[PDB]
Design a protein around this ligand. Structure first.
Ligand SMILES: *CC(=O)NNC(=O)C[C@@H]1CCS(=O)(=O)C1
Length: 225
C-alpha cells in the first residue's frame, strides 16, 4: 500500500503535525464532517492518482453510472487526436485506463481496485493517461482557459511543461480541466497553517460531489463523508 493507503480514522493524521495548534484545530473541525482518510504518496502525481482511485471507487456496484462512464471513456481517444496526440503514442496509456474501468465493472471489489492503483506500472500508466487527457482538453478549449483563468498565459507551453510530464505539480487549471474532461464532481478541503477558516471549493461550482480531497502540502489525500 505504498501509493494509496488503507483507510484510517481521520484523527490519525494529528501525528503528522504534532504540537501544531492551527493544524490540530483544523483537523478536529474536519473530523466533525468526515469519518476516514486514505493517504497518497507525495511524488508529484498525487492529484491524478487520488482523483482516479476515489472516482472509480465511488462507481463500484452502480450499473447505470458505470455504463455512462465507459461510454465517455470510449470517446476520449478522439479528444487526444483532435489536440494532436498520435494514437500509437497514447495506445498503451488509454489501454491501461480502459482495463481498470472494466475491472470496476467485472470484479467490483475495493480490494482489486486498490491492488491496481498500488501496482507501480499499472498505476503510473493510468496517471500518464489522465495527464494526456488533461492536456488535450485544455488545448482544445484554449480560448475558454484564456477568457476565464488568465488572458496572458501561454497555453501550449503550460501544457508541455506543467501537465504532460510525470511528477509535475497541479494548480486550479488542471483540476478544473480533468473534472470537466471526465464529468467528475469533486470538493477540495483546504488546510493551511494560517489562523483562518477551514474552507472548501467544488469543481464545478454548482454540483453534488462524488469525490472529496484534503489539500495541505501541495499534497492531496482522500476523504470519506
Ligand atoms: C500531489 C503530490 O504528489 N504532491 N507532492 C508532494 O507531496 C511533494 C511534497 C510537497 C513538497 S515536496 O516536493 O518537498 C514533498
Amino acid at each position: 500500500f505504498n501509493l494509496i493507503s488503507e483507510k484510517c480514522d481521520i484523527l490519525s493524521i494529528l501525528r503528522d503535525h504534532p504540537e501544531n495548534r492551527i493544524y490540530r484545530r483544523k483537523i478536529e473541525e474536519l473530523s466533525k464532517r468526515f469519518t476516514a482518510i486514505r493517504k497518497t504518496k507525495g511524488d508529484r502525481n498525487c492529484f491524478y492518482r487520488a482523483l482516479g482511485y476515489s472516482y472509480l471507487e465511488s462507481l463500484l456496484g452502480k450499473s447505470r453510472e458505470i455504463f455512462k462512464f465507459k461510454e465517455r471513456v470510449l470517446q476520449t481517444p478522439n479528444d487526444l487526436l483532435a489536440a494532436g496526440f498520435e494514437e500509437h503514442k497514447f495506445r498503451n496509456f488509454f489501454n491501461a485506463f480502459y482495463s481498470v474501468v472494466e475491472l470496476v465493472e467485472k470484479d467490483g471489489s475495493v480490494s482489486s481496485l486498490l491492488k491496481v492503483f498500488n501496482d507501480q506500472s499499472a498505476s503510473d500508466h493510468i496517471v500518464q493517461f489522465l495527464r494526456l487527457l488533461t492536456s488535450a482538453f485544455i488545448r482544445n478549449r484554449a480560448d475558454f482557459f484564456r477568457h476565464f483563468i488568465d488572458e496572458e498565459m501561454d497555453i501550449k507551453d503550460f501544457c508541455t511543461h506543467e501537465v504532460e510530464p510525470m511528477a509535475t505539480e497541479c494548480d486550479h487549471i488542471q483540476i478544473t480541466a480533468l473534472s470537466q474532461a471526465l464529468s467528475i464532481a469533486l470538493q477540495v478541503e483546504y488546510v493551511d497553517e494560517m489562523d483562518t477558516a477551514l474552507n472548501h471549493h467544488v469543481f464545478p461550482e454548482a454540483a453534488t460531489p462524488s469525490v472529496y480531497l484534503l489539500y495541505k502540502t501541495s499534497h492531496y489525500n482522500i476523504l470519506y463523508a
